[PDB]
Symmetry: D3
């Protein structure tokens, strides 16, 4: 009882994040991949749970590292329970996720767990490095980073599923395109949506001072102006300053450029699904997510 | 190569390696090896894993405790920033797990998970009580310390036990030692980190817990802890009060009692001159 | 102009007189006079005395509560500063005692002292619970409200009874109305956003109001409310989450039913004292919020 | 059992200030003035209690209005229990003091309590007015206010004692001289004393931004400079700015002027005491208090 | 060459995107109807004026802690206070370099004189505000005539150095200076309808004594509200809305409008006494449209 | 009328800085160079005042741009009178100094004044740009910037003197060596100690000074210094750590040797112009900072 109550007190920040939207995409994603994997439901429930645990845990930590205010329209967990509480709680879930990952009875599972998490930390580390050392990455550099940030859990889930699946053709190429698709879509939405209130508040990325795909464009597209770089350094919440930044980004074509990149990423993804036999479920998701641009 | 990433991510950890402390961990490892006698090949990995996880947790704890100094050095997030150190410290955790996967023992990762979760339970209660303003009892407090310290204490000795025919119980001594360390650390943080950094943290340390429960007609300590202030005089006031209600003598008396329990447990396990000397060296503070 | 100092010290108080509220106080005094039938010379003194202390206490309360708006107006310390408002509000307390010394009744200062100490006890517990992070129970809260509100209510009605032949006990109703008023205030400060205070200013104060108290004890598996209250945050998004939780746990319905029950109980008490058409109407008007 | 527990919890901030030194000086004052008033111990004890209670409550409120950090070497009560709690507690003691005055069985006590209290608040208001409205007063204006701030509590004690005394000789002139002597000595010490935290912290008056006797001199003595006014507006805790201000005050002779004013106040007190029959106890007190500016 | 000038002139380039050059241009045209300045000199004078004028607004925004100018973020809100300080002072001396191309022995003399006048005006405005000393109406106007007269006199004065028109225009320049500032003061507080220039009642957040506020302060000396609100330098929308309600209720806005209406009339008469200026008359009529509502 | 009260109000921050030590070195510097230029005392006196005004004015502005707390042991002027007043006051003195330069009666004086001031603003801008855009410069880039920051006022003084001197030999190389000597010596003291600024105020400013610059490039495997500079922290313990790091990577030793080299080069340059015992003594006295004994 004391143990179960003491645990309960510690998992509260995680319980809060469970109320946020997102499981739908995670659930649909797993189903889409199983059209190829045909993996036992018994193991999947574990892998599904493990993925949800590690994913939400990373988002709890990410909100702290990004000084974000809103997530999926909800206050971020550390806005309520406090940063020291959420840090320990999220880290508790990491090793709770290993405990569940220790039940797949596959000797190669723990290896994939460790590898995928270290890969995830590499990406987040680089994003935090560039932002907090005021060094804008190049378009190529940014893309490389997300492939480790997104690729960490994408490969963790898909990989653990493949451990008990007879499908064995390489799925890393498609996962990378999707990882790009999600983050760049995330970047486009965080700055192009006004009061849609889909996930975060108005241009929360500018207040974080982070380098997202649109801002990265304007920085290199227009090396004759240092406006964006200076505005990001301010890490300000001033709406007028943020509104100016967005107008400039449109004027330099950063938003139009991002849309075409997102539009291009969708096309490549379609081919990758088709080259693996086709995935009516996975193909459908992309079309739904593609409603954001144009 | 792209190996500049590892350097970038491990810089905050590399910074903390410059701090004193490895001597105590090494001497502790050697002292327990007089009984465990683990093959050096495995032992080498065990020490590395222990040092990584210990330092990695200490990076995170300083963030959770809003601490300013550690063993006389600035905290890592005071230099590299909280976001970077968080990612780096979590990075080292899982690098440490990778290293445990080189011990080639089916029960190694099992001990790893259990001990690590045990540490998080201890930290959680320490954080929960402090951030929900509910001072624990001595029993509740000591019970928490037994998991916080026991997390890393049992990890090392446990991993050492994984490759040793010495199967005698060291947990009583491990629990006595973990208690000894924290209560000792609590005592030092207030009787000697910057001036009373624990008071600025607002944490319930062993000395403060005594006065809170000892003289319940005053809520002074509780309120001072809630302010989480950096005022030297306010901090100076608290320690004088703690001293006047005997909170420090009580901590010393508990420490002196803890010292005896360790000595008796050491002799009851055959004796460990290296260990006994180490404890004696640490026991000089409450003399 | 001789001691123009009075003007300097009374400026914050004059600022608060511009705020709505006197109507309820006037109508309340009128309703009770239907039973007490107080001499106009004495009643007028009591009315001023009541207004002074009531406004003075609200000035102090706004400071202790870090409030931003009162009845749609900036709080006085938002303009003249916290030190000035403290001194002036304490000045008005003791100006009121001077005025009570004109009621001639030897027991007036005694009534004044007791009623004021009771009000300070109520505010103290409200402050104690909030600033020592210990949520009270419903009974504990209600006991406190009966001391906070009972302080000025009993002083007014009490002073009137000193010069009245109606010697029947009115304290049960005074307590019922006091709870009614505070619990009604608690409901609105969180159920609306406009009018009086700003959006959920009580959550930013971190104080335990009736709706929050319910949610805290109703669902002991969650510490959200406690933690949100500890943040003393001004984030609208966090506050919107808090009310949503309060609504989803039924704390708002519980407050309405508690208020509706208090309204009914009041009616029973009014009739038991002969009936008071004026007072019955006041209650009915104030009850329109629970819909 | 209950309610009395509430009184204890609500009176704690007051109990904390009782640990502070000072009761001795208040006690010696009561004894010294009673050499003339010869008040019955039955009444005197309450007058002493009423005086001590209201004074400490006023010092609690004063510390909040003055953003003070230390009083008599101890942290200010609101630095421990918080401003909202101390306010309610001090005002609670105010009316607790009134309850005590209702035990003198003299009907003119309630009048005196009211009058002296209103007088004190007038002084406090003006001091706060000048400071928070950035309007330095004249020397005459400052002294006029001090006679109301000190006289409020001074007149309460001596006056209440005189209600039960056959003396009936006019003592207000002496109380006024003592009132000035006390404040000007406080003003001088808060700025001239070493970094020695005997009462308040280093030049806490400059951080308060208040117009104390020394600063008042420099402002009018040298009207070609706005240094002092500008430093007081900053309300800084910068040691270097504060040390510079004291350097300026010394160079314009403000500290010497304050000493000479205090030396005169002491001399006048001797003459005033002599004119009322003499008071060896009071003479000893002033001589002891005068050792600081000598 | 390594013209690092671009890096240093970036904050200045940022402010050129703001509206305003049109009004400065129309003023030049209106006054050239009398002065008839040679085109070669006039073009430079226009450039010198635009440089020094924008440079002063860069410095002023820092001194006034403003948030918006002409609907745009203030330059130091992006590039930072240290950069804009150095950049605006750089442009001052770039303007001096330019004024030396008029080849007039008195141009630098007039330049120095006019800039010192502007700093006297700016200093007094800053002095009263940061020493919490409200000026009297006459005192306020005297400062405005020095603040505005600084650039007004530099432009027209430099033009007159190359003009056969030698009639005194300073009386008209003073009227226009007052008209400009008081119009600005009124708009910053009465035009809550739009964020066309500054943000909502930024003058109250600056704590400056503007014409509307000055009236209420002296008109109602039994109240210290305005003074106290200005001392708070608060960004509270509710406190600001209260101040405007108070200002309107004591007639400070009506008083300001009547003063502006009078300044408009005086300007028309002064223009006619100088021969008439259809161009200038049109500008005043257009600028007078804000308070005629 | 006769309101020199405005002047007092506007010049109070400037008069405050005159109480600070510093005039002595400037006086000795003027004397050392007059041993070659031999300028009429009437012209010399004006040149000295112009230099004193412009130099002090820039330091008032510089302290604002550098968030400095102390100067020469005294609080910075804006810590007392406020940033807005000091900015306006300091810019006022610039234009007062221009007025004074108009009294040297040389047709090229204003030209030299303008040119030198633009150069100083070029240097300061580069210093601020690197700091507020978090991009450490190279040693060569830094040295080039210092030649414009110091060169502005060094060349203004010496340049103005040479306008009234028959000594027409080139002093810019020596002027540049001394400019570097002065800045790098200040950098050394701000971290290793000069009874000037507060403890490692340069770390709190986040500026790239010569010692820090070394550590940045000397050990490029570490981002410690850059990150510490970005924190813009006032923590004495963090500052003390940086100093330990700087010493352990040899940044202080490298700075000392660079200064010793500048000292020798200065002596060689001085001898090359005929010798200057006065100037040689100044360098020797200032060089005691980087000597063990
Ligand atoms: C295939 C199955 C069964 C599940 C999918 C596995 C999943 C959901 C992997 C997560 C995909 C992803 C994009 C992970 C990134 C996690 C993370 C912490 C991203 C941080 O991105 P930021 O842009 O820095 O922060 P925001 O999300 O607030 O924008
Ligand atoms: C015995 C062998 C072979 C090795 C030693 C094994 C280890 C690492 C022992 C260390 C035990 C210990 C003291 C663990 C504490 C971990 C932790 C979370 C400390 C944080 O404690 P706080 O209460 O926050 O106070 P400090 O910040 O001063 O640490
Ligand atoms: C004359 C008659 C018949 C009645 C007089 C009417 C009076 C004086 C009523 C007072 C009743 C009341 C509600 C008193 C409250 C006083 C007080 C300290 C209010 C502040 O408490 P909070 O809990 O902070 O609520 P608010 O912040 O909304 O004010
Ligand atoms: C004469 C007898 C028998 C008794 C007198 C006992 C008392 C209470 C005398 C009053 C003495 C006095 C100086 C009262 C002043 C009241 C007060 C709150 C002054 C505070 O003014 P500040 O300028 O803030 O100075 P401090 O904050 O340093 O105290
Ligand atoms: C007549 C010709 C040919 C040209 C005139 C062109 C110009 C620039 C005339 C000067 C116009 C003017 C009013 C200048 C004042 C500059 C200044 C320092 C304004 C600052 O006043 P604030 O009170 O700060 O109000 P804002 O900050 O909103 O501008
Ligand atoms: C040579 C003769 C005849 C006279 C002396 C002429 C002068 C005053 C030369 C001054 C050279 C010098 C040191 C110029 C630098 C001025 C400046 C803008 C310094 C600011 O740079 P910082 O690095 O911030 O210096 P601080 O550390 O003092 O703030
Ligand atoms: Mg992130
Ligand atoms: Mg994020
Ligand atoms: Mg901890
Ligand atoms: Mg800690
Ligand atoms: Mg309240
Ligand atoms: Mg309230
Ligand atoms: Mg005071
Ligand atoms: Mg005081
Ligand atoms: Mg301005
Ligand atoms: Mg302005
Ligand atoms: Mg600089
Ligand atoms: Mg500097």
């Amino acid at each position: 009882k004391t143990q179960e109550t003491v645990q309960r007190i510690l998992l509260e920040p995680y319980k809060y994040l469970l109320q946020l939207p997102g499981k739908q995409v995670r659930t649909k994603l797993s189903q889409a991949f199983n059209h190829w994997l045909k993996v036992p439901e018994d193991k999947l429930q574990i892998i599904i749970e493990v993925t949800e645990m590690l994913h939400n845990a990373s988002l709890l930590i990410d909100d702290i590292e990004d000084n974000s205010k809103l997530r999926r329209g909800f206050p971020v967990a550390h806005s309520i329970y406090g940063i020291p509480s959420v840090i320990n709680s999220a880290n508790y879930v990491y090793f709770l996720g290993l405990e569940k990952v220790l039940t797949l009875d596959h000797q190669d599972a723990v290896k994939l767990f460790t590898r995928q998490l270290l890969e995830l930390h590499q990406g987040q580390g680089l994003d935090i490095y560039w932002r907090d050392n005021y060094t804008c990455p190049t378009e190529e550099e940014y893309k490389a980073m997300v492939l480790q940030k997104t690729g960490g859990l994408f490969g963790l889930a898909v990989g653990l599923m493949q451990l008990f699946s007879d499908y064995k053709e390489d799925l890393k190429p498609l996962l990378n395109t999707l990882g790009l698709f999600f983050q760049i879509r995330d970047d486009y939405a965080n700055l192009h949506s006004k009061e849609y209130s889909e996930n975060k508040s108005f241009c929360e990325d500018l207040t974080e001072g982070k380098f997202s795909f649109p801002t990265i464009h304007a920085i290199w597209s227009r090396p004759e102006s240092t406006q964006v770089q200076n505005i990001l350094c301010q890490r300000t919440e001033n709406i007028d300053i943020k509104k100016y930044c967005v107008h400039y980004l449109e004027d330099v074509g950063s938003f139009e450029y991002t849309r075409n990149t997102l539009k291009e990423l969708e096309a490549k993804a379609y081919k990758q699904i088709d080259a693996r036999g086709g995935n009516p479920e996975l193909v459908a998701l992309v079309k739904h997510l593609s409603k954001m641009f144009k």
